[PDB]
Design a protein around this ligand. Structure first.
Ligand SMILES: Nc1ncnc2c1ncn2[C@@H]1O[C@H](COP(=O)(O)OP(=O)(O)OP(=O)(O)O)[C@@H](O)[C@H]1O
Ligand SMILES: Nc1ncnc2c1ncn2[C@@H]1O[C@H](COP(=O)(O)OP(=O)(O)O)[C@@H](O)[C@H]1O
Ligand SMILES: [Mg+2]
Lengths: 28, 99, 395, 889, 393, 140
């Protein structure tokens, strides 16, 4: 009877992937 | 079928093959249709309540024609109430055997 | 589809006879022109050629997004399944007319452009509150009102079924109707009887279920109720039992009763403040009438107030008949033993008698009907009233 | 169901009418006193209308129908009073006694004898006794009589006066909204003899009311927005004397009998122009009636007000002719330099600024035919006093650089710069005239006819351009000299300079483009008489077009001025005249569809609309009469702009489905010029459905056909948010949709909506709906765009200065004698009110509120308040006089 | 069985009925493509489907939207989050000018090289979009007849500075930036609200008072911020409150455990109304039925200046409201209304219009085409008797 | 009811609306009753469920000596117990015990049988278990 409330958060997860055939030099 | 697993390509997202249902979770926990035994009329001390259940459940089942002659509907839902463990479970267990 | 918007003679004037036969001519000739397309060049130009141009234009995997906002004509903002938002342009393949915010879409991979729309489901709130079908008995159930029937018919039914008389004089129908009287009279019956024989949608609301233990949800349920009722259809909103939820500002207290005041204050504005709601029929039912807030009672909100009295010996002879119309009747009974005697008892008491006689007979496992069934049932319904009565002798 | 016991009337009126043949013979008192005791009682049980169920009228005829069938005929000795008791009682339930074949036998009870004065027992009752039944009489019974036997027996003779009092009764019971039910009676009764019905109803209306004129008054013109041809011929002259005889509102004469000018008789409105010259009290209604007579629907009136009162009451004529036109110049001089405009905006071309960074760099477009559009950055924006000293140097260099037709075009653009001018318009041409070139002078001297257009004073009736024309042994001195003067004297029907320019037709000097625009020039002048024009044109037509089977320079220019000389009459005589005149081969019977429907600008005649498609529907037609079905569709474009939104929705429903989707050449080449002719304001139905066939050019065809539909999709003036549609199409149209052929065209389309800020009124709808042609100036262009090869040579005469009949824009002016009042005006969306609860909220978009020169717009009916009484004309028309009066505290 | 109501009753009907049936049977005969799980009908995208869709494929981009935190010196060097992807330090592309890229702005950024292309309008949540009215009802000042003093006071305050900012300059005053309206119900509060929203020449913003009470704490305050932020952008806008008793009337503290969250929301309305950096051009109208139990912080002038009350006029407003409501209907020319107004001395304009709508029912209780004076006599015969023995009165 | 209504629908009342949907659909019992037994009786939506759907309510009092003796024999049925015992004294040492408390006694008697290292269950096991559970029942 007439009572407020606060809240909360449930953050999702995250993930990434690639073909992984890229070289990272290009320097020299 | 709806709610059915499928095999899916990672590139074109095409279906390959219907995967089988693992179990049917309702029909894996399908509720038991176990044997309706009574412990009999020897739940004495409750006999007034026993006479009520006979006249609201057994009397529609045993005597449909008293309702068919007089023209009144047969009941289908009975509510029981009291403190817990006073035979809410075990009495309707018995009546399903008496019929 | 929206072929010609003119209706303005609205009678048997010769103008409508000329206009609609022009519309008959422009439609026959458009048909007879296009009938001579599949006669002389009967080509199938766009069976798959329209489709295979576009199914190859869109990607084969489709992805469902969500609308957030709409900007000028082609580019709008969307939301992916994770929250990444894209400012992509829509194509002229999707119905732009049913494209409102809060809807699922179909997207692309590279440019993520909006390709199509997925149709919506049915909201649960209609399935909660709407009496979906014609529920119960028609006007063969009611016992001889014939004036209260006449008022509700020309306030709701005859406006809805045959609107032609109001628009002759340009006079709008009255808006609100209060049903009131002693309890057990047939207030719920008359709502369901009009809900039986109707052509528009009907909404039943129990007023006692409008008090949440949270707060703000009082006005929240109200502002969504007329929102659904407006957006759905021609609608008739019935709210039973407003007497013990919206009475008055009796002490101007706080702690819950102030919240109940705020719910009725929203309902008062949501009933009628701004931009007259249109094709919304409001019917309200009470037991008590005196302790009601007069800001609801004033015209502009409710215009019809109908008393529900109790007949004494005349309509009861059918109410006793209708409740005994589907049952047996041995020849030892006369309904005039009870109709002629007492003159105040409700129609709900009559149903309480006509069921109890069926209870007393089959409990003792007997045959059809005795007089002593109706004797003991009438005696019982007295105690069904009297055992909750504190009355002594002349107060 | 509580019946039985209280059924008094289902017993004794069931018995005594059954005892009426049991008491007709041998009972002389029971035959009549039980008849009178029944007749008053059923009349008593019928006058109250709270019970549609009557306890006899749905009860007695279970036997009373077979009773009356054996009581009324079978008595055969019907006396003088027992007929006034039988027929007065038994003619009442007969619409409900009988079923739907009552319509031949509303007479076998009633017309035995109509008993006395039937409204004696039918006065207070609304429609239940006989008023619906009298409409059931006049529907079927009088019409079979009045189909070929109007002059007949009792079925017309008493029926005239019987309907004569019922028509009074609609304004007698309560004077309801069923005043308009009396035209539901007067039109259904004697449909073609409506005037014989109206003549009794004119004088009955003359003594009816002076407050209850106006809604039936507008109901007549509601019924006169369209009709049958003879009905539209009939009720519109019946419409005329009701503000003349009953009321003297009488300021709705000159424009709302231009309604009745062309149908009934041209002299009849001239007799009403004489009726203008009768009601000469005093000036204020008089001045505003004659405001419209110059440049609002017609001119040619400057010869009838030089009679014996030439002091101020007839010295309004020249003030009407050019001085309020100079006050119409004082609009754009004073009031429009105040609101927005300095002399050179110039920057819609500069609004193409962000294109050079969209995709790297720019400076790629070097097409010399874009320089044609480079004149219109100067050209279109300088209308309404955009005068330019050395701001024409983009013209002045390009006048002396190349492009002979653009030397003609840049010189012809100067006339649009000094528009509606007589004061110094020739002074501006003369310094740019003397270059001694065929293309510069004939562009400049053609622009001289543009400057003095609408003036029709002494500027050059035979002075300048006739001296220009006689110089001919050559090019456009031969051509461009006849065009400007016929443009300048289009609104007149002067005969003399027509006969100065009839030997242009009679020369037979075979310059084909000169004789083609000659029929365009003379056609702009006259619309009625002078059959010698129709003689002179077809003489050279049989000389030249018979000895050819070639280009539409023959076809788009010569039969058109014929239809310009016979525009606007649904008589179907001019079709009998012109089509039997050029009985000929089908490439010369291309001209069949021209003068047929040029007389059919707007009415309701869908029997012509069915012969407008059913004859030449498709036929699959291997490139023979494809132009004939194009021009047949061209005449579908009119008869649609003025049924007042009635066939307009029907036109967009047909042509969006029938032609452009499932047609071959009629749709995919030509069928978009409807939208370049029907609607002139733009709404997102057609403004979006056309780039749904225009952004897709469908380049397989000669794509300038669809790019022709690019250009006059921007034939919607009154500037909008549609810069997004054109500038994005100009961005895709730079590289693709190549600039060799349309770089003029897209920017011609771009610069046209913002012609000026104002002066867009080209709709051919004045007051509320009358034409004001107008049509003679526009329709040359949409006929001209068929299809190609005039984007380079011949159409540059046309495409610049074809339509030049914009009448001005706005209605915010007050003109109380000093011209100092502003107003308290109130602009709104257009009216919807036709017949509802009197009086009526006239419009709906009341939120906007201005006081002074604010705009016109397409759907607007602007009113006022503050009790200034606005008492002038009560329709509208943009020079309200606005006297003042406040006798209301 | 039945009868003709007016002459050719079915004869016009089925002519209209079958052609609406035929407008269907056109389309399936042509071949119609409907209900194809969310597409467009084929008659208008077949000439859209081709290469001016490739003009939207290859030249157009995706342009992922973002949010700006701040700027740097001598150069843009903007710090920007996406939403939940990563926060970046990125630069504008060359198609913009570095002027309207102020902080706290939703902007669209290229997906490949992460560069700014388009500035976007900010996030306005729809719950306050649905209270901007965006249309104006047709209510004339003449329709609120009987209130010559009350409209004239309210004309002076709401209307006249917004349409004549001249006289207040030439005398050197400040207009009373807030007005309260009150009185007995059904008297014309909402009429004047609609009539000013008619002639507003402004961004009129509706507010229902109970839309602020919510379930969570502080979010009811966050509405009031977004109102006064759009108010400072939409210059010279009007804001209408209604039934402000729900927004808060008292500061009940004897047992301070009752209502608190409405008090916090009401205090937020106090600060953004007046105090610390005034609002400029915003006028506020309020309307309640009990203007007695309000917090005197609202009653301070500067906030609520004029207390206009609405009474039951005298005897002649009723005759004029008769001439407002019973001008617009179809009656007999034998009107008189001093006879009518003397029969109902204590009545609201709602009770006036209830009679005029009741009067049309008697003609439909009968079977008439009109409204007779004697019928309107019989209309005012019953409603005197109806109001004498009414249920609540 | 609609307490967890428009604020998320909570998935459970939507199932209850499908319970009401089928019972509205057709039974006429046909051969099948449904039985439901509850405490906390005054919270649910029975007023909509009174007409036709469900029916008469039956009260359960606290038990008695002959009731608890029968409840003792039923819940001590599935055991390996030893005879030579007065169960009626065991039932009459409990003045106001509930039937669920009887089930806890039969566990403790089997627990006392376990610490005997016996599969006998004697009278000594119950007489201490009744004293133990009633000691656990000695809070109010
Ligand atoms: N002075 C008046 N002139 C014309 N109509 C009036 C007048 N007073 C009331 N009415 C009519 O009464 C109706 C109610 O008016 P309004 O909505 O302003 O009441 P209210 O003041 O909003 O009531 P509450 O105080 O309960 O909110 C209006 O629709 C209006 O048509
Ligand atoms: N005139 C009548 N005809 C038939 N049954 C009636 C009549 N009046 C009352 N009843 C019986 O009494 C009950 C009336 O319901 P109602 O009076 O609307 O309850 P409440 O007023 O408390 O909502 C119905 O169940 C109906 O069976
Ligand atoms: Mg209000």
């Amino acid at each position: 009877x007439x009572x407020x409330x606060x809240x909360x958060x449930x953050x999702x997860x995250x993930x990434x992937x690639x073909x992984x055939x890229x070289x990272x030099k290009x320097x020299x | 079928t709806p709610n059915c697993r499928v095999a899916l390509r990672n590139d074109s997202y095409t279906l390959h093959k219907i995967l089988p249902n693992k179990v049917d979770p309702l029909v894996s926990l399908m509720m038991v249709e176990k044997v309706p035994d009574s412990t009999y009329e020897m739940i004495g001390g409750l006999d007034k309540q026993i006479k009520e259940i006979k006249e609201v459940i057994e009397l529609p089942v045993k005597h449909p024609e008293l309702f068919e002659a007089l023209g009144i509907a047969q009941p289908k839902g009975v509510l029981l109430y009291g403190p817990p463990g006073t035979g809410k479970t075990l009495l309707a267990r018995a009546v399903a055997h008496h019929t | 589809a929206s072929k010609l918007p003119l209706v303005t003679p609205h009678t048997q004037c010769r103008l409508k006879l000329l206009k609609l036969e022009r519309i008959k001519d422009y439609l026959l000739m458009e048909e007879e022109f296009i009938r001579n397309q599949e006669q002389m060049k009967p080509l199938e130009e766009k069976q798959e050629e329209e489709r295979s141009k576009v199914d190859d234009l869109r990607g084969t995997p489709m992805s469902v997004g969500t609308l957030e906002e709409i900007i000028d004509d082609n580019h709008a903002i969307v939301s992916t399944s994770v929250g990444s938002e894209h400012y992509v342009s829509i194509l002229s393949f999707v119905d732009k007319d049913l494209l409102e915010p809060g809807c699922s879409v179909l997207l692309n991979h590279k440019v993520h452009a909006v390709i199509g729309v997925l149709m919506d489901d049915t909201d649960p709130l209609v399935t909660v509150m709407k009496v979906e079908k014609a529920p119960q008995e028609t006007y063969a159930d009611i016992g001889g009102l014939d004036n209260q029937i006449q008022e509700i018919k020309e306030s709701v039914e005859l406006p809805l079924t045959h609107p032609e008389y109001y628009e002759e004089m340009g006079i709008k129908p009255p808006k609100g109707v209060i049903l009131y009287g002693p309890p057990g009279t047939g207030k719920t019956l008359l709502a369901k009887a009009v809900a039986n024989q109707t052509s528009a949608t009907f909404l039943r609301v129990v007023g006692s279920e409008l008090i949440q233990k949270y707060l703000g949800d009082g006005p929240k349920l109200v502002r969504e109720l007329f929102r659904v009722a407006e957006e759905h259809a021609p609608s008739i909103v019935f709210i039973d039992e407003i007497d013990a939820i919206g009475t008055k500002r009796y002490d101007s207290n706080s702690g819950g009763e102030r919240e109940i005041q705020r719910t009725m204050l929203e309902l008062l504005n949501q009933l009628d403040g701004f931009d007259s709601r249109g094709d919304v029929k409001v019917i309200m039912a009470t037991n008590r009438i005196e302790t009601l807030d007069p800001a609801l009672i004033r015209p502009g909100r409710i215009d019809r107030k109908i008393e529900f009295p109790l007949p004494d010996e005349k309509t009861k002879k059918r109410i006793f008949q209708i409740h005994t119309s589907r049952m047996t009747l041995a020849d030892d009974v006369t309904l005039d033993d009870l109709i002629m005697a007492k003159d105040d008892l409700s129609g709900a008491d009559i149903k309480a008698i006509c069921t109890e006689a069926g209870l007393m007979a089959l409990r003792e496992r007997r045959m059809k009907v005795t007089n002593e069934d109706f004797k003991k049932s009438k005696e019982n319904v007295l105690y069904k009233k009297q055992e909750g009565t504190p009355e002594g002798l002349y107060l | 169901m509580e019946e039985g016991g209280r059924d008094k009337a289902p017993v004794q009126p069931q018995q005594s009418p059954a005892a009426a043949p049991g008491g007709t013979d041998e009972k002389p008192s029971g035959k009549e006193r039980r008849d009178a005791g029944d007749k008053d009682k059923e009349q008593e049980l019928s006058e109250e209308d709270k019970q549609l169920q009557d306890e006899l009228e749905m009860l007695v005829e279970r036997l009373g129908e077979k009773d009356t069938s054996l009581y009324r005929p079978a008595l055969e000795e019907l006396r003088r009073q027992i007929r006034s008791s039988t027929t007065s009682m038994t003619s009442v339930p007969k619409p409900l006694k009988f079923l739907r074949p009552h319509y031949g036998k509303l007479k076998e009870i009633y017309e035995n004898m109509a008993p006395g004065e039937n409204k004696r027992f039918a006065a207070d009752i609304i429609s239940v006794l006989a008023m619906t039944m009298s409409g059931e009489r006049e529907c079927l019974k009088y019409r079979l009589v009045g189909s070929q036997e109007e002059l007949a027996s009792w079925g017309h003779e008493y029926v005239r006066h019987l309907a004569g009092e019922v028509a009074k009764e609609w304004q007698e019971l309560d004077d309801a909204e069923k005043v308009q039910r009396e035209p539901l009676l007067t039109l259904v009764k004697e449909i073609v003899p409506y005037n014989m019905a109206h003549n009794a109803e004119h004088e009955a209306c003359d003594l009816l009311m002076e407050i209850e004129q106006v809604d039936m008054l507008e109901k007549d013109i509601d019924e006169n927005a369209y009709a049958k041809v003879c009905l539209y011929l009939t009720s519109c002259v019946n419409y005329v004397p009701e503000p003349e005889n009953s009321a003297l509102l009488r300021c709705a004469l000159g424009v709302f009998r231009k309604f009745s000018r062309f149908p009934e008789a041209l002299r009849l409105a001239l007799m009403l122009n004489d009726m203008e010259l009768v009601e000469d009290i005093f000036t204020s209604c008089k001045d505003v009636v004659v405001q419209k007579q110059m440049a609002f629907m017609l001119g040619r009136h400057g010869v009838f007000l030089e009679l014996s009162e030439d002091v101020e009451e007839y010295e309004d004529l020249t003030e009407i002719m050019s001085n309020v036109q100079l006050n119409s110049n004082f609009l754009a001089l004073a009031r429009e330099l105040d609101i927005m405009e300095p002399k050179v905006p110039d920057d819609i071309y500069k609004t193409h600024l962000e294109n050079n960074r969209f995709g790297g760099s720019g400076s790629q477009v070097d097409s010399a035919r874009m320089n044609l559009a480079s004149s219109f950055v100067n050209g279109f924006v300088n209308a309404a006093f955009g005068q330019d000293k050395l701001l024409t140097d983009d013209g002045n260099k390009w006048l002396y650089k190349n492009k002979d037709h653009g030397m003609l075009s840049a010189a012809a653009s100067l006339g649009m710069i000094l528009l509606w001018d007589v004061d110094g318009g020739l002074t501006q041409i003369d310094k740019y005239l003397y270059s001694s070139e065929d293309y510069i002078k004939s562009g400049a001297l053609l622009a001289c006819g543009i400057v003095n257009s609408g003036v029709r004073n002494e500027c050059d009736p035979a002075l300048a351009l006739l001296s220009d024309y006689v110089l001919h042994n050559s090019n456009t001195m031969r051509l461009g000299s006849i065009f400007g003067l016929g443009l300048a004297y289009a609104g007149s029907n002067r005969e003399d300079v027509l006969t100065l320019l009839l030997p242009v037709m009679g020369d037979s000097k075979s310059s084909m483009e000169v004789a083609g625009v000659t029929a365009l020039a003379c056609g702009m002048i006259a619309v009625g008489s002078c059959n010698g024009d129709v003689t002179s044109t077809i003489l050279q037509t049989i000389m030249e077009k018979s000895e050819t089977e070639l280009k539409d320079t023959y076809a788009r220019w010569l039969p058109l001025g014929l239809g310009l000389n016979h525009l606007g009459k649904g008589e179907a005589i001019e079709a009998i005249l012109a089509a039997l005149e050029v009985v000929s081969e089908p490439f010369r019977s291309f001209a069949n569809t021209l003068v047929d429907v040029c007389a059919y600008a707007g009415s309701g005649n869908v029997l012509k609309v069915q012969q407008l498609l059913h004859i030449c529907s498709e036929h699959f037609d291997s490139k023979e009469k494809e132009e004939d079905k194009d021009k047949k569709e061209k005449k579908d474009k009119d008869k649609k702009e003025a049924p007042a939104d009635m066939g307009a929705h029907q036109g967009v429903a047909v042509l969006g489905i029938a032609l452009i989707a499932m047609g071959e050449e009629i749709g995919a080449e030509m069928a978009l010029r409807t939208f370049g002719h029907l609607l002139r304001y733009g709404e997102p139905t057609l403004r979006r459905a056309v780039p749904l066939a225009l952004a897709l050019i469908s380049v397989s065809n000669p794509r300038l056909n669809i790019l022709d539909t690019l250009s006059k999709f921007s034939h919607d003036a009154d500037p909008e948010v549609s810069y997004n549609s054109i500038f994005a199409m100009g961005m895709v149209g730079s590289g693709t949709n190549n600039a060799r052929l349309a770089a003029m065209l897209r920017q011609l389309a771009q610069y046209h909506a913002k012609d000026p800020n104002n002066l867009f009124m080209v709709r051919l709808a004045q007051g509320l709906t009358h034409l004001g042609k107008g049509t003679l100036t526009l329709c040359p262009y949409h006929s001209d765009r068929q299809l190609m090869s005039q984007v380079a040579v011949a159409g540059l005469l046309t495409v610049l200065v074809s339509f030049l009949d914009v009448r001005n824009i706005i209605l915010g002016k007050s003109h109380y004698v000093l011209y100092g009042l502003v107003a308290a005006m109130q602009p709104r969306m257009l009216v919807t009110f036709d017949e509802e609860l009197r009086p009526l909220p006239v419009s709906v978009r009341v939120g906007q509120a201005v006081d002074v020169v604010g705009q016109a717009g397409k759907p607007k009916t602007i009113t006022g308040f503050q009790t200034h009484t606005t008492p002038v004309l009560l329709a509208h028309g943009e020079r309200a006089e606005l006297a003042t009066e406040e006798f209301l505290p | 069985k039945t009868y003709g109501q007016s002459t050719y009753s079915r004869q016009i009907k089925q002519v209209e009925d079958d052609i609406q049936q035929l407008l269907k049977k056109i389309n399936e005969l042509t071949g119609i493509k409907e209900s194809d799980t969310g597409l467009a009908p084929p008659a208008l995208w077949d000439l859209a489907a081709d290469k001016q869709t490739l003009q939207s494929e290859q030249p157009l981009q995706v342009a992922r939207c973002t949010k700006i935190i701040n700027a740097d010196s001598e150069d843009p060097k903007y710090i920007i989050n996406v939403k939940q992807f990563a926060k970046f330090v990125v630069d504008l592309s060359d198609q913009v000018a570095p002027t309207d890229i102020e902080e706290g702005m939703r902007v669209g950024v290229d997906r490949n090289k992460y560069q700014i292309h388009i500035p976007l309008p900010p996030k306005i949540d729809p719950t306050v979009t649905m209270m901007q009215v965006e249309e104006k009802p047709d209510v004339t000042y003449s329709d609120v007849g009987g209130c010559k003093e009350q409209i004239e006071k309210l004309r002076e305050v709401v209307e006249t500075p917004l349409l004549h900012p001249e006289r207040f300059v030439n005398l050197g005053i400040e207009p009373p930036k807030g007005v309260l309206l009150f009185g007995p119900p059904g008297t014309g509060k909402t009429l004047c609200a609609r009539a000013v929203a008619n002639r507003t020449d402004a961004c009129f913003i509706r507010v229902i008072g109970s839309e602020l009470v919510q379930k969570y704490v502080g979010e009811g305050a966050r509405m009031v911020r977004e109102l006064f932020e759009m108010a400072r952008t939409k210059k010279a806008c009007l804001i209408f409150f209604d039934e402000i008793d729900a927004i808060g009337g008292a500061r009940f503290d004897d047992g301070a455990g009752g209502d608190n969250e409405v008090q916090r929301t009401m205090l937020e309305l106090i600060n953004q109304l007046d105090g610390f950096d005034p609002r400029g051009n915003i006028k506020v109208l309020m309307a309640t039925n009990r203007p007695d139990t309000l917090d005197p912080a609202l009653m301070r002038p500067g906030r609520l200046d004029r207390k206009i009350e609405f009474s039951l006029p005298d005897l002649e407003g009723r005759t004029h409201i008769f001439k407002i409501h019973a001008r617009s209907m179809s009656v007999e020319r034998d009107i008189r209304f001093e006879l009518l107004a003397r029969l109902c001395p204590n009545s609201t304009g709602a009770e006036i219009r209830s009679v005029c709508t009741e009067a049309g029912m008697f003609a439909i209780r009968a079977r008439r085409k009109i409204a007779t004076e004697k019928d309107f006599l019989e209309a005012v015969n019953k409603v005197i008797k109806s109001y004498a023995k009414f249920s609540a009165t | 009811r609609l307490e967890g209504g428009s604020g998320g629908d909570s998935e459970v009342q939507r199932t209850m609306l499908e319970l009401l949907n089928q019972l509205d659909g057709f039974e006429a019992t046909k051969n099948i009753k449904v039985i439901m037994a509850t405490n906390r009786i005054d919270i649910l939506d029975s007023a909509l469920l009174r007409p036709g759907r469900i029916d008469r309510k039956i009260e359960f009092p606290p038990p008695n000596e002959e009731a608890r003796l029968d409840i003792l024999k039923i819940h001590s049925r599935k055991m390996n117990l030893t005879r030579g015992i007065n169960l009626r004294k065991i039932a009459e040492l409990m003045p106001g015990a509930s039937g669920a408390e009887v089930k806890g006694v039969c566990t403790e008697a089997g627990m006392y049988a376990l610490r005997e290292r016996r599969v006998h269950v004697t009278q000594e096991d119950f007489e201490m278990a009744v004293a133990k559970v009633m000691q656990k029942d000695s809070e109010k």
